[PDB]
Amino acid sequence: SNISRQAYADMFGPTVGDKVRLADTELWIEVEDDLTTYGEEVKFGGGKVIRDGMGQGQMLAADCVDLVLTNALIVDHWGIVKADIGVKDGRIFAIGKAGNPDIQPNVTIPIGAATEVIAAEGKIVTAGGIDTAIHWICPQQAEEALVSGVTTMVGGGTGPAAGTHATTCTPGPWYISRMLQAADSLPVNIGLLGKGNVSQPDALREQVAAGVIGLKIHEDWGATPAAIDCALTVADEMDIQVALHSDTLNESGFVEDTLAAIGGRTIHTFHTEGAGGGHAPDIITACAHPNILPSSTNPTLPYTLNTIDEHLDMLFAESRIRRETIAAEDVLHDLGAFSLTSSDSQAMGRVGEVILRTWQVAHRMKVQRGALAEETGDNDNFRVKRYIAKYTINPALTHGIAHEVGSIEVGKLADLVVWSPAFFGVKPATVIKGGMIAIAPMGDINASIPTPQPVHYRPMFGALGSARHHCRLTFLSQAAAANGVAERLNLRSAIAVVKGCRTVQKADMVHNSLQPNITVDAQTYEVRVDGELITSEPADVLPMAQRYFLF
Amino acid sequence: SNISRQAYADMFGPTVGDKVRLADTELWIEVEDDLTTYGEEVKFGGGKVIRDGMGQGQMLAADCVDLVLTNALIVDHWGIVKADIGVKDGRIFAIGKAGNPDIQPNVTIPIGAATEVIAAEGKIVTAGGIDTAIHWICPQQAEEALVSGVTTMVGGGTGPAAGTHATTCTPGPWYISRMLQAADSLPVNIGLLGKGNVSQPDALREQVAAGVIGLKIHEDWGATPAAIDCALTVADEMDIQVALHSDTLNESGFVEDTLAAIGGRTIHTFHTEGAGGGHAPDIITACAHPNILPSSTNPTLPYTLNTIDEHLDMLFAESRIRRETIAAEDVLHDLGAFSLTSSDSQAMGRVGEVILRTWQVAHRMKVQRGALAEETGDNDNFRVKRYIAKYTINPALTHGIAHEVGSIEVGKLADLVVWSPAFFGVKPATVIKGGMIAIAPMGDINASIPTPQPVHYRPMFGALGSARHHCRLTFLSQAAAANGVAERLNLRSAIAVVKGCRTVQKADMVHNSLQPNITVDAQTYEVRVDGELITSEPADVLPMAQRYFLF
Amino acid sequence: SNISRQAYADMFGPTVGDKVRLADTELWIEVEDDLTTYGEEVKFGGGKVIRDGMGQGQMLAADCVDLVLTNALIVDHWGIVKADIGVKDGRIFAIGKAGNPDIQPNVTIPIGAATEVIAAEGKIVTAGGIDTAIHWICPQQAEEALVSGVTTMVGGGTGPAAGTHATTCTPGPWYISRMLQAADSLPVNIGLLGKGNVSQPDALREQVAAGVIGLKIHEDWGATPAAIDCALTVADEMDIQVALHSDTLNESGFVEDTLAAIGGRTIHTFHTEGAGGGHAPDIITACAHPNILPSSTNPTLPYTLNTIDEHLDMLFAESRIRRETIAAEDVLHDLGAFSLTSSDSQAMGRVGEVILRTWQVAHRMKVQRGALAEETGDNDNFRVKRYIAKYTINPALTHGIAHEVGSIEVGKLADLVVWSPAFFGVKPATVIKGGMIAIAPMGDINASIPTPQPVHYRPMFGALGSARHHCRLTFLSQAAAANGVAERLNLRSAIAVVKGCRTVQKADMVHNSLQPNITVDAQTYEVRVDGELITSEPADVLPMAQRYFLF
Amino acid sequence: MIPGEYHVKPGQIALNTGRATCRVVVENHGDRPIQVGSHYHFAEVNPALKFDRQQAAGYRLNIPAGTAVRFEPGQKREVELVAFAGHRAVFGFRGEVMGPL
Amino acid sequence: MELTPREKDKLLLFTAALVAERRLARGLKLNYPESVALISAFIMEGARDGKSVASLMEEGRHVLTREQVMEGVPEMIPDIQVEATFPDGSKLVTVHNPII
Amino acid sequence: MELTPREKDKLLLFTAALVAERRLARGLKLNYPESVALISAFIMEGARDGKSVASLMEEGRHVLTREQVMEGVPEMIPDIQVEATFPDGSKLVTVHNPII
Ligand code: NI
């Protein structure tokens, strides 16, 4: 028959040409494509489509998916499309049209007796976030981050010890081993960073062989040219990434001396703007280099009225906390010069606010700068793809784990986050880890339905014992994997190895590969790209704030 | 010497002829027998009986019980008697007279150095409940149910997914395996149900071989004659039970067509009254058949003033929510035509209210119908035995696990619930799983005694890691057990196999085997047995409600 | 250069000659020694000492410590000194001067890339407490005790059962095994006590072979001369300790008969004052014997205005609750006649108050009796060493585990507690178990730093899964260890064996070896030592109370 | 209506019926109180209690299970004893019998 | 008190409503969680008083108006559901479009 | 604040008493958990004020009367016990037959 577009959207979610507002921001996404065959959409329920002989077929488990997310509006770096998502063996099987080939046309995702269903009509589905600036100060950070939509956490620490409070470093074999063991208890994928500050290669090789997937060079442990060179030499031979928090004091030299020590080798610069640490006042100039993968920590995102007052106290202080570089950082993100966003958890950063803040920056930039030169059509699709890549695929590429996670592509681990449009980026409807729901808002346990109050996030089956081990990954360096570290420490979770950390360059950062001719004035701190001043205005009120939180 | 009956009851609990009110209901139980030898009762404490050479003997561990529950008033389907209960190796050892044979007469339960003591004088002891309509929407349901007195949970689900929200089905090998692994973390015995809606036998055999102990046929996945026949054929060959939620829409046929498809084969009909689902408006007529084991879900038990208003909204709606069948269901339970009670957790049912509601029905029926034809004496003993069987032994028989749990009989797993008479059926004093206390009300942890406020239910040693694995059972199908599923998934808990699911019939339901000549009028929905109208009046106030709960 | 002592103390913590007030008590400690080289103290931070080539060297993991606690003020039975503490492989490596031998003088604790840092300047570091009177009524007691600064718990129980409510006994092989398995889940070192009340040796040998590290003789199970002799005979052959709660009723005899049955064999008398149990009214006279290791439970410590009113009700009652012996007990502790303090958790004792109450006694005694004859200088150093030994080394010696824990000495397990002087004995800053922080006050998880409110104790990485197993010990008897009990029950934690329980005597109790010529008047209950009356006055207000607790 | 109330039928319960009993005068000669439990082997009680221990051999107090009889210093009283049953094998107490009788 | 898990969970809801209640008193326009907690706690007290499910489904739509809450809030709350112990046991109250 | 587990547990008791307190104010006859929470919180505040254990054991029997609670409630509460930090440390208060 025929159906009106409005009634259609109400029943199956929006289709090609319909626009959706992201939470309470000014960002609008438009459905670019819809992989369905009108009239053949699968819907679950009494008298609905997914029933024996109808939308559900006669195939054995091996010939059908374990889970299908029906009528999902996918938002990812590659597109904003409407489709069914098939998950098999904890991995993304296909993005297409689900159903029963026996009676339906164009079926690419077969549903059978072995198939569970998650109704995603009217919802937005995204890959899980990846935070790469974690200070393991306490294990509670994992639940907080998972609830926000982050499913992979890379960082270092041993608990609430002075070294960890300050740096993302897990010092030495003993602590590395203890933390790899502790990781089996957390519901997020984890990779650890060791202490890279040493001028003796063997002291670094040991940590890599113990299991770390990267080495953190932090100024508090001495970010000297000698230390930097040593860590990069070992990284080049062991295929692990190096993360940097440079010499703010300019003790061993200026930014150009650090850049010189790096010598064109691949490196991930943390909080590239500088308030979070780094050569004062020009560490921000690192984003001009092809071998630098630059990220921001979240307290400075986006520039608001209280930012400075807050930072100055949170923290010579005036040489590090500069209104000039903080205002410019938002714009550099909008332009693609900065490629990742991270937290810097409980050490000048908020663990549950990586996603939320990334979207507030996009909103503030749309409001201030209008449409991006790359936009096409009357929507913010390109700006949305540029920003979502900052906490998904780009962090995955920087740390050599993009072969496992980072986006919604076939064969990748099924770490997915389901959002209702009104709460997008703020409070998820469902967080899936490796094919099983791990945490979700849950109402009264004794109620007749799962919706009665009070509704708050509670751990689900994917976060329990052995089911959790099967649905999470512990990333190891190739050396540790070869040495049998997993068998020796008796690790229970699935193991993944990092690779390709040395070959990534700025040009590889999805939708964020700009290398601007940027300069910072030594006296005024003004940031200029090609001579033009880069700046922005502080927000008085932001979306995704007081309308959603109780405190 | 001599002692007055009142002082006696105060010290050792009631004896033969004494009556006890169950909570705040109108139900009174009378002690039918007392297995003690007056003057030789064992009591624990300073200067009491259970001491070396006195009530405690010189035997080795192998010759004495690990735990004795002293002076318990047992309420079970077979009797309401006063006795000591001996537990050895996590199983019920004996029900008799405890003590030391060296100096005491008639000792059948030897107490030695290896014996722990639980003082049950003045308390009622019952078997743990068994809920067979669980939707595994969240893992928190297990603690809620355990606290209520339910120790075995049978059902299906994968978490808060649309399929599970609607049905008690764990779809396919992958999810079944994940859930069997997750079950090791829960403090209740667990058995899973697979998705039985398919017209291809092999798709069902796979699920059974993966570990499910039954197959659920649900209308949302297509409860067609073809699907029903297929599931029953596989059940007949694999010795597993089939649970049914029939076609409410009468899409494939009426109730007689479904009954015809079943063809006299054993089947468990969920929520047989219909409000919870099933051929409108006469699915209730299934309780007339010898091969149907009929149960009720709990939101309709018992019929009260707010039931309809609540259900109509919770939920053509008027064809499913009928005052006529809801009023009759209470009576059919009183008569033994309905044999089990269950929840339908967070899907039109309340997980912590299976026991509580069963007793409210008994109370309401005593109030409205007086004594049962089977009662003898001035007490409600028979009515109490008929109802307790509804959530203990009958669910165990229906699902083939009665050889392990379901009642207080020698050799069965020691899943016991201790109640104070004033809180019977509402809030347990102690919940024992496999010989160890698993949860109990516990006061201030830092207090000088365990009783100071605030007192709330907290997990005990029987719910912890390895002790938990040893005190709980994961039920498997005979096929899964033979295939080594436990070893492959590396299951840590004790394993039990289901058997005898195909041979149970209505006549086997303890104290609830009535097969009435029942009819439902297609137009008026009136229920009649032998031509006589069956109905009841809605309660305005119920016992076990506002006097006990804070909210 | 030069620096003033005040600015010095502010930066590095106090040094030789400086005094510190312990919490809000009247006790002052004076730094006796400082192992540093002025100008070469190690400090961690931006631009500080612990950096590559500076305070951090080039050595491999094997040649440096895993953790260093910088500038700690150690308070232990052997001294009150300022030093750096090195921890390697979960054990105390050295107490000395930390740094890099390449550029610094007198380095005894090498810091390298594999070294984590905990800043202890301005903090007091002590060994973890050891509570030996635990009733395992609920598992929550472990977190409560750990938070208070207690890292080892010795006791018995099976949960909230009548036997355990009354006694610290884990009855028989089955329960012992279940509890040894459950112990792997708790973040404290654990050793269990079996039921020693039997007149058949083999029934005791079985329990010892099952894993108990001691046998508890409790009057509720019959504390008869026959039972006592039997337990001591087995203890003498199996090298395990015996703990006693004597016959308060004087049923089998008086205190001299019990003492006679013991026959000069080593035994630990619980709550030696008597209010907690024991021959009325003179069990307190046991502290005069060389083979008796006497302890107090905590509700009577220290004597206050509400003590009696509270006890009389908590509890012939007047023969057991005596103001005369309760007042004397505080003094006997001050004199070293009583050697240990314990709780008697949730059975006439408070699990989180062992340390807190021990210090309140010291304060009350300083206030009432002035300086100890052993004091030297104007400080309370000796009184502080005498009292701290009561819950650390003495309990370790009494139970044969002093080779593993009990004090801050090289080679012992690194169970350490870090305190801020203002909260000493009340609320710890950090609790370290086996080299990893296990619990600590933690602020807002989503905050930019770990300090924002609300700050409350939360479990850290050392209390998680496999990391926990590696950082805790389960103590076994030599027989159980030899029998392969750990392998059979599949225990995951580290195992330690007890030894030297039979050879300890009163003379071995550190700073508490007084054997007074004590007497108790049968009629008046007055306690006299050498004819002089021993008594004290009840406190109206105590330190470490209302200034620190919310309730 | 009282939740969980009892409706105990009036009357009394005869304890330890059909068993040999004997009365003994007992006097506490000690300076401290002594309390004896219902099932303790009376012949092996605290030595300070003066009585015909030979008559009390194999007997216990004929009182409701779990109760006790107290003897303040100097207190003299007549108690009723009831014989041990079962195997009549006494183990424990002061270790005076440790076997049958 | 022997509080079960569900009773303790409802204490969380009551406390959230205390927060909202104080803010409404200051003259603030309530946000999403505050609105849900306030109306929810209202219904629970209604059940404690003994009002019927029918009465509460109606009364619940008059606790907060569109002018007492932030923009967009009424649209974020299509309904509110909560269960409580009525004189006749636990019942579910669903208030549709509570804010207008 | 550095709240220990026991301090946090007592917050649960305080909140339960807030619920009971409001219901008593509406003129409702309190149920079992409400009665235990109200009298318990009363004692804790008494200790904070510095009253003695002896005084509280007595004052605690005059918080609620038999006419302010539901039928059967007084008989379900033979005593109430709670500990709190008195000026002289933690002490246990036991109020026997609190409701009459
Ligand atoms: Ni940094």
Ligand code: NI
């Ligand atoms: Ni159903």
Ligand code: NI
């Ligand atoms: Ni004791």
